[PDB]
Structures are given as structure tokens and as C-alpha cells.
Amino acid sequence: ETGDSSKWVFEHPETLYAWEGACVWIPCTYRALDGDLESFILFHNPEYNKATSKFDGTRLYESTKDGKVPSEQKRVQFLGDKNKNCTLSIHPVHLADSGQLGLRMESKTEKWMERIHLAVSERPFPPHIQLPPEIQESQEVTLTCLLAFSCYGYPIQLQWLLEGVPMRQAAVTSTSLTIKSVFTRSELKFSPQWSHHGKIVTCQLQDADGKFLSADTVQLNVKHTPKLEIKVTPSDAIVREGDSVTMTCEVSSSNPEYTTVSWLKDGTSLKKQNTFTLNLREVTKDQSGKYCCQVSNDVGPGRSEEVFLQVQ
Ligand SMILES: *[C@@H]1O[C@H](CO)[C@@H](O[C@@H]2O[C@H](CO)[C@@H](O[C@@H]3O[C@H](CO[C@H]4O[C@H](CO)[C@@H](O)[C@H](O)[C@@H]4O)[C@@H](O)[C@H](O[C@H]4O[C@H](CO)[C@@H](O)[C@H](O)[C@@H]4O)[C@@H]3O)[C@H](O)[C@H]2NC(C)=O)[C@H](O)[C@H]1NC(C)=O
């Protein structure tokens, strides 16, 4: 390395991702204080040789050879110019391209080697689902699927699935292919209910035709108030005076776990009744009415259905 960093400025994604058979599109801009370029060489994994004071390694593009040939056919194309643009294109990209790309540039009196890492996986890597840390029932959440890839030669699509079924909601797909970031994003608005807790949400990466490429899956953690099931003995809730009545309050689902329970009779809170079992001994005709239980967790309180107790 015999370069003066004050003579060069570069703006590019410092790491780009792709997979075998796809393509990579590398946005890149630069400014050379020493003037226009006189030569550009694209190395793959360059190594500086102290003997000849030169860089050894595989040359993927040479301005003196490839820059004189019709390049529309070529796999490796330099789409830049002499003063401001260093954009690269590799179509198709191969696993052997994985490593660091060496942008060897020379002005009239200055030389520089700008390095960009290219991570190519053998298989298409999965996207990444991003969820809010807190999801509760009846809340509208934006499901975000992020893929750190985008290239013009290889269009793709992100498909949202809920329990293996494509989601009916429309998704908004956005792409960025700039010197700052390269990604494909999909956003889907979605209002989960309590029944979506524990279900599987899938974001599939597909090609332009719809062939499966990869997928990321998340198991939804959906907070919800306790869903209650109330039972009464006797079953018909019809008694006569003096008999005993037992009502129980079962939590069929709660996220997070319940913390308290109370009982109500015709809208009136039953004091000293803070367990999941209500026992009425020697019932009078005044104890007739509509009974229900209420159970609360961190989300909020829930209520069971009403039992119409009748004292004949
Ligand atoms: C450095 O300089 C180079 C060349 O001057 C610039 O490269 C151009 O970049 C633009 C995008 O920034 C490219 O436009 C895209 O073309 C894609 C298809 O390319 C066809 O056309 C080119 C010729 O223009 C052919 O060579 C090629 O074989 C194809 O036939 C489209 O798919 C793209 O459309 C997508 O993006 C647009 C928004 O940009 C959306 O509206 C579309 O819906 C779609 O999503 C896009 O139009 C252009 O092709 C590139 N030129 C060349 C010759 O390759 C670099 O941008 C520049 N670097 C910087 C950092 O500015």
C-alpha cells in the first residue's frame, strides 16, 4: 500500500451480498484530487508484493483490455468513468467471486487500491423478518421482511405467508441500490388477534417467475387478555334454596400469564372472591342473577360469559 488517503474519497456499500447464479450490482462514486483516471484494474483478492512493489492476484477487469472490447456480453463490467463513477457489475456472479474486490486506480501521479467485500453464498440466503418487540391483539403492526440483496439482472419478490397460506393483505415492496445501502424490503400491514399467537409467519424469497429461493419464518408472540371459560355446577344453573352452587373460571389462553381473578354478580364486584372458584352455600332467591369472572394479565382484563343462576 503506497497510497495517500487525502487524495481519494470513496462512497460504496462496504459489503455486498449475493448467491451463486444471481448477479451483483455495486454502486460506487469517487473523487480523485489528482485528476482523471489513467487506468483501472479490478482485482479479486489482491495481495501486495513487496518485491516488485505491485499488487498480485486475479484480474477480473482491465481498462486496457476489457475497456477496448464490446462489454455488453461480458460477465464483469466496469460501468464507471474517469472522475466520479466506479460502479461495478458482475452478471452472473459466482461462488469463486467471493472475497474482496480490489479497485486498483491510477491517476497521473497517484495510485490507490479501494477494497470492497463481496460475500457470495452457494445457495440463496434467507431474508430476515423484523418484528416489533411487543405485539398485542387488535394492534396494527407492519411486518417487515429485509433481504440484503438487489441487482437489476436478477429481479426477485418477497411473498408473505401465514400458516403456509399467502396473506390476503397487500404488501409494499421497496428496493434500495445506492452507494449507502443495498436491500430489498417488503412491508405488510397486519392486525393480529389472540388466535395468531404461536402461529408461523413466513417470508419467501422467490424469483421473477415465482420459484422458491429461500425463506425466513417466525413464530408470532401475540399478547392478549385472558380468554376465559366459565363452568357451573349444577350444569343447568337451576337450583332451589339451600342448595350449594360451585362456579369455576378456567383460563383457556393468556399471554403473559394471569395475575388476578375476581367475580361479578349483575355488574357488582363480589368482595372476598379472588380465586378461580366461586362457592355459594345455602343459596337464597336473592343470590339469583348473572355471574361472571374477570381475569387480568399484563395486557389487561378479560371477562367470561355470563351464567344465569336461578334459585327456584
Ligand atoms: C455509473 O454509471 C452507470 C452508467 O452510466 C450507471 O448505471 C446505470 O444505472 C441505472 C440505475 O441507477 C440503470 O437503470 C436501470 O436499468 C435496468 C435495466 O438495464 C437495462 O438498460 C441498460 C441501459 O440503460 C442495459 O445496459 C441493460 O442491459 C438493460 O437492458 C432497470 O431494470 C432498472 O429499473 C429499475 O430501477 C428503476 C429506478 O432506477 C425503477 O423505476 C424500475 O421500476 C426498476 O425497479 C433501471 O432503470 C442503468 O441501466 C445503468 N446503466 C448501464 C449502462 O448499466 C450507474 O448508476 C452510475 N453509478 C452511480 C453511483 O450513479
Author numbering: 17 to 328
Paper text:
One of the best described Siglecs is CD22 (Siglec-2), whose expression is restricted to B cells. CD22 plays a critical role in establishing a baseline level of B-cell inhibition, and thus is a critical determinant of homeostasis in humoral immunity. CD22 is a single-spanning membrane glycoprotein of 140 kDa on the surface of B cells. The extracellular domain (ECD) of CD22 is comprised of seven immunoglobulin (Ig) domains (d1–d7) and 12 putative N-linked glycosylation sites.
To facilitate crystallization of CD22 ECD, we created a truncated construct that contains the first three Ig domains (residues 20–330) with five of the six N-linked glycosylation sites mutated to alanines (5A: N67A, N112A, N135A, N164A, N231A). The three N-terminal domains of CD22 are arranged as beads on a string and extend ~110 Å. As expected, d1 adopts a V-type fold. Unexpectedly, d2 adopts a C1-type fold, rather than the predicted C2-type fold. CD22 has elongated D and E strands in d2 that generate a remarkably large interface area with d1 and extensively stabilize the orientation of the ligand binding domain. As such, d2 of CD22 buries 721 Å2 of surface area on d1, which is substantially greater than that for Siglec-4 (684 Å2) and Siglec-5 (461 Å2). The N101 glycan is positioned in a hydrophobic environment at the d1/d2 junction, burying 348 Å2 of surface area, which helps explain its importance for CD22 expression. As predicted, d3 adopts a C2-type Ig domain topology. The CD22 V-type d1 domain displays unique features compared to other Siglec family members: (1) the C–C′ strands are elongated and extend into a β-hairpin (hereafter named C1 and C2) that shapes the Sia binding site; (2) strand G is continuous, without a loop insertion; and (3) the C′–D loop protrudes away from the core V-type structure. Overall, the complex and unliganded structures of CD22 are highly similar (Cα r.m.s.d. of 0.35 Å for d1), indicating that carbohydrate recognition by CD22 is largely mediated by a preformed binding site.
